[PDB]
Design a protein around this ligand. Structure first.
Ligand code: CLA
Ligand code: CLA
Ligand code: CLA
Ligand code: CLA
Ligand code: CLA
Ligand SMILES: CCCCCCCCCCCCCCCCCC(=O)OC[C@H](CO[C@@H]1O[C@H](CO)[C@H](O)[C@H](O)[C@H]1O)OC(=O)CCCCCCCCCCCCCCCCC
Ligand SMILES: CCCCCCCCCCCCCCCCCC(=O)OC[C@H](CO[C@@H]1O[C@H](CO)[C@H](O)[C@H](O)[C@H]1O)OC(=O)CCCCCCCCCCCCCCCCC
Ligand SMILES: CCCCCCCCCCCCCCCCCC(=O)OC[C@H](CO[C@@H]1O[C@H](CO)[C@H](O)[C@H](O)[C@H]1O)OC(=O)CCCCCCCCCCCCCCCCC
Ligand SMILES: CCCCCCCCCCCCCCCCCC(=O)OC[C@H](CO[C@@H]1O[C@H](CO)[C@H](O)[C@H](O)[C@H]1O)OC(=O)CCCCCCCCCCCCCCCCC
Ligand SMILES: CCCCCCCCCCCCCCCC(=O)OC[C@H](COP(=O)(O)OC[C@@H](O)CO)OC(=O)CCCCCCCCCCCCCCC
Ligand SMILES: CC1=C(/C=C/C(C)=C/C=C/C(C)=C/C=C/C=C(C)/C=C/C=C(C)/C=C/C2=C(C)CCCC2(C)C)C(C)(C)CCC1
Ligand SMILES: [Fe+2]
Lengths: 29, 481, 248, 333, 34, 41, 37, 50, 65, 41, 29
């Protein structure tokens, strides 16, 4: 049953990575 | 404006709100103490204080209560085995409830001090701005703490007007709370002499009282005032952190190595009891004297108390558990039932083979039998192909003395191997592996847990002191070069 | 106070006072020398102290010791109005209890919160005195049996009982419908009723001859209650005083 | 300026966050001790014998109960109506064995609610308003007294009072039905009518008032934000609400004097609850509801069952089972 | 347990006398209008 | 097999700090939007 | 009593939010198995 | 318990100590109200005169 | 701001602030005391370490009871 | 005895909505403080 | 072990009640 927890944690980390690339603060000069 | 790690700096120049925040912290600490005591009382089992002591059940707060004199409980039982009739308010439950009430009152006081922050007391008449005379506040608080230390030493330890402290035997068989007379000599600095505690507290009281009077009267010199920045509260913070991690290191060391303030019966045996064969040597000496006075070997071994034999077991070694093996020791082996008796290994020529006990480092150790001169005589072969020391080739027998198996002997091959493997690690005991679903793995003492937590906290607080002292010294530049 | 003093008091003066449990004292040590065929018309057995056999460690060693315990039931324990025929087989006084209020439900609480109910009874007693005349220094002794604390008509919280009630645990129907159904539960579904044994030892003290009354001190050890065989019963030790009047 | 005066003044002050008053001197300590004892007992009270047959019942959280099954078990049947404070027991353990905390909590709670009524009146007097809110609060107080004190008085034992818990409340209600036939009592009918009517009138009054609300807000802002505390004009249109109500049912049938409307709102549930508390009080002395058992008989004489006979059947089923071990004789007197 | 009875008997008479003498201290005069 | 208390430890230690950080960011953005006049108050 | 002159605000960038979320999730990933044991 | 009882004083100590609380209250009340004999207001619940 | 009764009692304790003695004050006594404390600490440490053996002081478990 | 999955259900259902509501209140107050000029931006 | 959860829930509810009385929005006219 802990396989579900491990999978959830890994997918959540991947989603966080996804949001940090395509939804980042645009740096302006 | 303020980054997340800098959020608590608003209370830097609001003497009033500081008090409120320190009071909130005090309330949280007291509430934790009370709630932890209540939980431990809920899960405690005061049935057998011989083979199921407090340290065996994972109690962390109970030893600190029992050290200072709290033994009775409202349930009618006593930690020293006896029964108590009508204990007073100062039982385990009374202490827990008192702490919870203190937490609540501190919470209310914190609310009041946060709401009424602008008190004229925290103002400087000369300038009109909030300010604290730190060299004078220090004198006041140090004088108070010296008075408290002297009172505790003279009245609550010497038993003049107090219960006393926990005092035990050299082997932790008969220990109880009693007043301790101070030792005003070189032996007062013996860490294992309980009179040293009373002597220290009385002398350090009479010393800190005079120090506090001095600080109340005498003003600082200008050179020190400018050098130490004795007008900035953060230098107080850094120095206090310094003292705190110094104290944490000292306490962790004294618990790991043992002292009069960390008795065996409360926190369990130390690591170094097992290395030097402390209890094993004591057991051998007692058996030798019982034989010398004239008695059968079986009855000589049957006079050894079960507590003493239980100390000589590797499951009670604090340096044996793991970091993530959670729970009490009973979760590791089960609740100890009874002593199985001391086995004696003999071979065909009637020698006395002894099983080499495993050291604390190893987790798997081979079963090896050696004679009185340390020469291999038998073992359990890993590869039984050309083994010349197997337990079957060299006939070896066991004869249990003084226990559940007292007077019994075994000549069979598999049973001798079973008992050799059992006796490879300390004495042999009977455990209940079903009450808690005990798995096959050891666990650590409250001694080890306290030492680990406090050593790590001290190591972190050294860094905290470094950072804060550096921030005090570089205050003017701490915004940009 | 003695029976001659309680008989002066009216019922209104006694109610509530709590002396209904107390046993009348006897004064004026003397010898009765009972006539054969006489019997004890009244007999009050009052326990003054209760203890339960328990295991406790003194200095690293555990041994069977009787630990004290406070009684939870208020003022029920005392027995009274026990009657029995005294006989002389070989010149020895034998009480032989026959009838009277001789049982008394009682609950006592051990240190640690343990509650031990037991039936304090003197039934089928057979005393064997150390002579004849009930005289200062007499001893009786004897053995007795203790009936079941709960009779057949008692129902468990789930509705199971011996003479009446469900034979199984109706709350759990999945335990049925399986070849070997409720078995682990058979120990609790089956209600057994067994009689125990108790040993009492009575020593006589000051004996009045004019009023034909005897008083003294008893020591009794009775087997505790077993919850219809669900739990192993405990051992209860009891000591106190007594009083009895012999009619000749 | 004396000390007594100064005190009396602080006590009757109307500028304290919570009004103390002279009734507060009875309400605060009593309610505080009642709630402290209740909280402790709900967590760590040992089992108590309630039927006085040496069969203790557990009601504490630490004894394998949950929030619903847990309760404060009433005192033992052996005690009956006798006063059982702490100091009359020989030990605190014995006091807990016979259910003393129930008596303590219930007596303190009753004194506290009476003092609460008094304090409501006292503040009404201090603020210069019309003094009849505590008359309205009397109905729950009367109900609580009937269920906690009057019924044990009539039955003759504190073991017959309502246990302080959920499942205990349900058990009390079921046993009351079995032994007394509460449903067929006209006062319980009046109480059900009062409670249903109270809910009906509350819902309808709220709907009528909120529906006719003067437009003083946008759509992207809570309608409640249109009203400002301390207004001088009505935020709702009585005319529109009365028009809707009259068109809904009838023209004659409708309230206009909003004062009469609010008086009726106060009157209905209060009189309902008073009548219900009187039902409980009357039935505490064994004046049960209607018994229409075997009332219908055919020509021959055989009995024809009605819906009441099935109620009697259910009552028998509950009755022969409640307190299974307590009874020794055929009648329940 | 006689001490506990003594302490409670005090608390009770304490608060009851507080009540009785608080309502005796010209309470009807205490009022918005004068 | 595994400890049934870890579940609570892992899940709470994952969710509570995450919601705390999300809270900090949301309130920062709300204050920033409030400071600048516009449709958001 | 009064308006405290020491009350400041609190800020957190979105990059700080991403760093914090990543740290929390990675710590959970690292320690989950050890907690489960 | 059920021993009837004048009030519920069983021990002279209990009566002699339920005494000082009421007498303490009488004294604090007398502190304000002393040397009062007349001043009849003759009005509906006035008691305006202190 | 909000003079409280307590505040009135505790005012003299916080009255003087920033007052200081000029010219090294009592620093040499602080040096003496710090050095003597260092000597005491090394004495204690070496006794506990069994690196300093003194008559009548055996660093071992003893029978207080 | 009891189900070991309830723990997660009860604790998550208590904490997550509570933190959601606390978040809403905090951001509302932060926006209100930002709208009014002052020491808070 | 669920007694701990029940106690925590009850005490948390009581604390919420406490904060709603002494830390309420002051209504002004
Ligand atoms: C009336 C006050 C009071 C009393 C009598 C107690 C009593 C107790 N507390 Mg306690 N406590 C209190 C207030 C009090 N507490 C407050 C206010 C808090 C919140 C901060 C706590 C938080 C607390 C916790 C967290 C714990 C206790 C525990 C205990 C028990 C063991 C005490 C012990 O071992 O201390 C040991 C004390 C010390 C080791 C302090 C050492 C002092 C240091 C070394 C001072 C060094 C610096 C000093 C300034 C040097 C200069 C002076 C010198 C020159 C003379 C005992 C029943 C323990 C327990 O068993 O829980 C039930 C426990 O774990 N308490
Ligand atoms: C008759 C007078 C008298 C007596 C009998 C005692 C008796 C005692 N004092 Mg003492 N004391 C007294 C007066 C007295 N005091 C006075 C007047 C003062 C001045 C306030 C002190 C100040 C004092 C301190 C500050 C300490 C004692 C300690 C002790 C105990 C010694 C424990 C031991 O063996 O070392 C065990 C401990 C040793 C400490 C060695 C120094 C720490 C070394 C570690 C350095 C640091 C932590 C860095 C570590 C880094 C590393 C881990 C990598 C003993 C109970 C010690 C205890 O605790 C202790 O630390 N006393
Ligand atoms: C450095 C501090 C410290 C140390 C050494 C220990 C040490 C221990 N704890 Mg503990 N604990 C602590 C802080 C600490 N705890 C705090 C702050 C909490 C509150 C979250 C707890 C909550 C806690 C629980 C709930 C349990 C322990 C348990 C244990 C034992 C495993 C061990 C004796 C376990 C045990 O066996 O105790 C009975 C256990 O079940 N602890
Ligand atoms: C007596 C102990 C103590 C006290 C009173 C302070 C007080 C302070 N520190 Mg600090 N510090 C300490 C120990 C202490 N520190 C130690 C031991 C370290 C080394 C790790 C540091 C490292 C440190 C840094 C690096 C900084 C401070 C800063 C600050 C200031 C702002 C704190 C803040 O905003 O935190 C706000 C904290 C939070 C919003 C959440 C932190 C949550 C942590 C990470 C985990 C939760 C903890 C849990 C419970 C802890 C259990 C306990 C036993 C530790 C404040 C004056 C800051 C400062 O001065 O700014 C200029 C700063 O930059 N401190
Ligand atoms: C307003 C305050 C107040 C009042 C009215 C009461 C009232 C009561 N308490 Mg009590 N109590 C209080 C505060 C109060 N308590 C506080 C603050 C505590 C915490 C220390 C306690 C702790 C406490 C305990 C531990 C117990 C009580 C008990 C009782 C009951 C019997 C007490 C008795 O015999 O008094 C006797 C007093 C008098 C005879 C003097 C009054 C005389 C005047 C004329 C009044 C006459 C009244 C008459 C009927 C009309 C009674 C209902 C007992 C109980 O509930 O038993 C079930 C009990 O065991 N109380
Ligand atoms: C100030 C002196 C207070 C004092 O001596 O308390 C003395 C009281 C005496 O405490 C008594 O102790 C007895 C057993 O020692 C019983 O527990 C009594 O119930 C308890 O009242 O103890 C405390 O309050 C400890 C004070 C710690 C400071
Ligand atoms: C608010 C929530 C905050 C959420 C963040 C949560 C952080 C969780 C981190 C805690 C991890 C502990 C989980 C262990 C897994 C488990 O279920 O254990 C379960 C064990 C309890 O163990 C259980 O106990 C039961 C009753 O005794 C039975 O015996 C069970 O068999 C036994 O498993 O929990 C713990 O060990 C106690 C919690 C941790 C105790 C404090 C840590 C120990 C002190 C060391 C501190 C030093 C730190 C220095 C750092 C520098
Ligand atoms: C002169 C006339 C003026 C008289 C003024 C007094 C009017 C009272 C007259 C009514 C008599 C009261 C009935 C007796 C009650 C009593 O004391 O014993 C009734 C019990 C007696 O208490 C129990 O008595 C038992 C009898 O053996 C045992 O002794 C117990 O130990 C003892 O606790 O006391 C109480 O529990 C009741 C008092 C609780 C206080 C309630 C306060 C109510 C608010 C007061 C409002 C002001 C009015
Ligand atoms: C994000 C988190 C959100 C937090 C809020 C959490 C809400 C939780 C509410 C869910 C309650 C379910 C917990 C049950 C307790 C338990 O552990 O169960 C545990 C059970 C699983 O059951 C377990 O299963 C295991 C594998 O099969 C083993 O068999 C175990 O023995 C068995 O216990 O969980 C559920 O039953 C599934 C979850 C609920 C399923 C959806 C609800 C059912 C559909 C009905 C929906 C209709 C709703 C209409 C409403 C109008
Ligand atoms: C009772 C307990 C209740 C729960 C409380 C506990 C929750 C508290 C948790 C807070 C900690 C948050 C720290 C994040 C917040 C955060 O990081 O903010 C980044 C922050 C940005 O600093 P600035 O000053 O630029 O930011 C100011 C504002 O933007 C934010 O305040 O920098 C720091 O805080 C310095 C620390 C850098 C630390 C870098 C961490 C990244 C480590 C690597 C991550 C793993 C990579 C794995 C690869 C293998
Ligand atoms: C108000 C009031 C009251 C009440 C009170 C109360 C009820 C209290 C409680 C309290 C409490 C109940 C508290 C608690 C606390 C707790 C705590 C404070 C905890 C903490 C912890 C921590 C912090 C930990 C951490 C950690 C982790 C998690 C992991 C590992 C590591 C560590 C250990 C670090 C009274 C009635 C009295 C009075 C009146 C008022
Ligand atoms: Fe209205």
């Amino acid at each position: 049953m802990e396989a579900l927890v491990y999978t959830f944690l890994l997918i959540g980390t991947l989603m966080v990575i996804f949001f940090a690339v395509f939804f980042r603060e645009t740096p302006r000069i | 404006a303020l980054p997340w790690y800098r959020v608590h700096t608003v209370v830097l120049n609001d003497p009033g709100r500081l008090i409120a925040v320190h009071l909130m912290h005090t309330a949280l600490v007291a509430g934790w103490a009370g709630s932890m005591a209540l939980y431990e009382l809920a899960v405690f089992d005061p049935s057998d204080p011989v083979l199921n002591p407090m340290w065996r059940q994972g109690m962390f707060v109970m030893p600190f209560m029992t050290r200072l004199g709290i033994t009775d409980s409202w349930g009618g039982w006593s930690i020293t085995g006896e029964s108590v009739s009508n204990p007073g308010i100062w039982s385990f439950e009374g202490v827990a409830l008192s702490h919870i009430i203190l937490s609540g009152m501190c919470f209310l006081a914190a609310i009041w001090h946060w709401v009424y922050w602008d008190l004229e007391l925290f103002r400087d008449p000369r300038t009109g701005e909030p300010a604290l005379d730190l060299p004078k506040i220090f004198g006041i608080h140090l004088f108070l703490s010296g008075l408290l230390c002297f009172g505790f030493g003279a009245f609550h330890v010497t038993g003049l007007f107090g219960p006393g402290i926990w005092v035990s035997d050299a082997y932790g068989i008969t220990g109880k709370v009693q007043p301790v007379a101070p030792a005003w000599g070189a032996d007062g600095f013996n860490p294992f002499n309980p009179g040293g505690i009373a002597a220290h507290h009385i002398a350090a009281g009479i010393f800190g009282i005079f120090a506090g009077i001095f600080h109340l009267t005498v003003r600082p010199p200008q050179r020190l005032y400018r050098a130490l920045r004795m007008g900035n509260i953060e230098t107080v913070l850094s120095s206090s952190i310094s003292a705190v991690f110094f104290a944490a290191f000292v306490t962790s060391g004294t618990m790991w190595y043992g002292a009069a303030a960390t008795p065996i019966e409360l926190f369990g045996p130390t690591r170094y009891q097992w290395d030097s064969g402390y209890f094993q040597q004591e057991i051998e000496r007692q058996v030798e004297t019982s034989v010398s006075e004239g008695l059968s070997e079986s009855q000589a071994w049957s006079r050894i108390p079960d507590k003493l034999a239980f100390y000589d077991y590797i499951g009670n070694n604090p340096a044996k558990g793991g970091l993530f093996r959670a729970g009490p020791m009973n979760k590791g082996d089960g609740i100890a039932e009874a002593w199985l008796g001391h086995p004696i290994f003999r071979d065909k020529e009637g020698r006395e083979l002894t099983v080499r006990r495993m050291p604390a480092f190893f987790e798997t150790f081979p079963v090896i039998l050696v004679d009185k001169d340390g020469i291999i005589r038998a073992d359990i072969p890993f590869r039984r192909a050309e083994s010349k020391y197997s337990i079957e080739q060299v006939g070896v027998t066991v004869d249990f003395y003084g226990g559940k198996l007292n007077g019994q002997t075994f000549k069979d091959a598999p049973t001798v191997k079973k008992f050799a493997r059992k006796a490879q690690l300390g004495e042999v005991f009977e455990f209940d592996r079903t009450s808690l679903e005990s798995d096959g793995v050891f666990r650590s003492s409250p001694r080890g847990w306290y030492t680990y937590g406090h050593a790590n906290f001290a190591l972190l607080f050294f860094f905290g002191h470094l950072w804060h002292g550096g921030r005090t010294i570089f205050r003017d530049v701490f915004t940009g070069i | 106070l003695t029976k001659s003093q309680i008989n002066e008091l009216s019922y209104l003066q006694v109610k509530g006072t709590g002396l209904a449990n107390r046993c009348a004292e006897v004064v004026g040590e003397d010898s009765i020398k009972p006539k054969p065929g006489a019997k004890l018309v009244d007999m009050c057995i009052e326990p003054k102290a209760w203890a339960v056999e328990e295991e406790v460690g003194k200095a690293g060693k555990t041994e069977k010791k009787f630990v004290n315990s406070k009684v939870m039931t208020r003022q029920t324990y005392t027995l009274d109005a026990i009657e029995g025929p005294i006989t002389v087989d070989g010149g020895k006084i034998t009480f032989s209890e026959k009838e009277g209020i001789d049982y008394a439900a009682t609950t006592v609480q051990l240190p640690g919160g343990e509650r031990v109910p037991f039936l304090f009874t003197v039934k089928d007693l057979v005393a064997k005195g150390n002579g004849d005349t009930f005289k200062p220094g007499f001893q009786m002794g004897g053995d007795f049996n203790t009936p079941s604390y709960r009779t057949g008509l008692f129902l468990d919280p789930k509705g199971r009982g011996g003479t009446t009630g469900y034979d199984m645990a109706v709350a759990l129907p999945a335990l049925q419908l399986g070849e070997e159904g409720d078995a682990e539960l058979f120990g609790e579904n089956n209600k057994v009723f067994d009689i125990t044994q108790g040993r009492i030892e009575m020593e006589v003290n000051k004996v009045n001859a004019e009023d034909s009354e005897i008083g003294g001190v008893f020591v009794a050890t009775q087997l505790s209650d077993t919850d219809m065989g669900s739990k192993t019963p405990k051992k209860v030790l009891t000591k106190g005083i007594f009083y009895a009047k012999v009619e000749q | 300026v004396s000390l007594w005066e100064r005190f009396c003044a602080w006590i009757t002050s109307t500028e304290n966050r919570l009004y103390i008053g002279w009734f507060g001197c009875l309400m605060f300590p009593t309610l505080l001790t009642a709630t402290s004892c209740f909280i402790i007992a709900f967590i760590a009270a040992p089992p108590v014998d309630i039927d006085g047959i040496r069969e203790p019942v557990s009601g504490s959280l630490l004894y394998g109960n949950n929030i619903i099954s847990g309760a404060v078990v009433p005192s033992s049947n052996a005690i009956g109506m006798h006063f059982y404070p702490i100091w009359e027991a020989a030990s605190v353990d014995e006091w807990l064995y016979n259910g003393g905390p129930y008596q303590l909590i219930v007596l303190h709670f009753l004194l506290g609610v009476s003092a609460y009524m008094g304090r409501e009146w006292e503040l009404s007097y201090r603020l210069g308003m019309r003094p009849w809110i505590f008359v309205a609060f009397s109905a729950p107080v009367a109900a609580a007294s009937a269920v906690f004190l009057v019924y044990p008085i009539g039955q003759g034992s504190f073991s017959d009072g309502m246990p302080l818990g959920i499942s205990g409340t349900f058990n009390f209600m079921l046993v009351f039905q079995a032994e007394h036939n509460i449903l067929m009592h006209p006062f319980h009918m009046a109480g059900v009518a009062g409670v249903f009517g109270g809910s009906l009138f509350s819902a309808m009054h709220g709907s009528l008032v909120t529906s006719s609300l003067i437009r003083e807000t946008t759509e992207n802002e809570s309608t409640n934000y249109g009203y400002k505390f301390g207004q001088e004009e009505e935020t709702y249109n009585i005319v529109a609400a009365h028009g809707y109500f009259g068109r809904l049912i009838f023209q004659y049938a409708s309230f206009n004097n909003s004062r009469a409307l609010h008086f009726f709102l106060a009157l209905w549930p209060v009189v309902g609850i008073w009548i219900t508390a009187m039902g409980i009080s009357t039935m505490a002395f064994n004046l049960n509801g209607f018994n229409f058992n075997q009332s219908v008989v055919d020509s021959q004489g055989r009995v024809i069952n009605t819906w009441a006979d099935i109620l009697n059947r259910a009552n028998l089923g509950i009755e022969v089972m409640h307190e299974r071990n307590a009874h020794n004789f055929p009648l329940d007197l | 347990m006689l001490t506990l009875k003594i302490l409670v008997y005090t608390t009770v008479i304490f608060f009851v006398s507080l009540f009785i003498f608080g309502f005796l201290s010209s309470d009807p005069s205490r009022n918005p209008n004068r | 097999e595994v400890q049934f208390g870890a579940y609570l430890a892992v899940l709470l230690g994952t969710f509570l700090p995450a919601l705390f950080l999300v809270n900090l960011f949301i309130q920062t953005e709300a204050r920033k939007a409030g400071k600048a006049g516009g449709q958001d108050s | 009593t009064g308006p405290n002159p020491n009350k400041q605000a609190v800020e957190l960038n979105r990059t700080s939010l991403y760093w914090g979320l990543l740290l929390i999730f990675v710590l959970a990933v690292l320690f989950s198995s050890y907690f489960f044991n | 318990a059920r021993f009837a009882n004048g009030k519920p004083q069983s021990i002279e100590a209990k009566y002699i100590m339920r005494s000082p609380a009421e007498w303490d209250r009488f004294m604090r009340f007398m502190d304000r109200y002393a040397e009062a004999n007349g001043l009849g207001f003759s009005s509906x619940x006035x008691x305006x005169x202190x | 701001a909000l003079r409280t009764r307590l505040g009135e009692i505790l005012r003299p304790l916080n009255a003087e602030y920033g007052k200081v003695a000029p010219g090294w004050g009592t620093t040499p006594i602080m040096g003496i005391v710090m050095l003597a404390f260092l000597i005491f600490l090394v004495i204690i440490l070496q006794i506990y370490n069994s690196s300093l053996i003194i008559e009548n002081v055996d660093v071992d478990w003893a029978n207080g009871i």
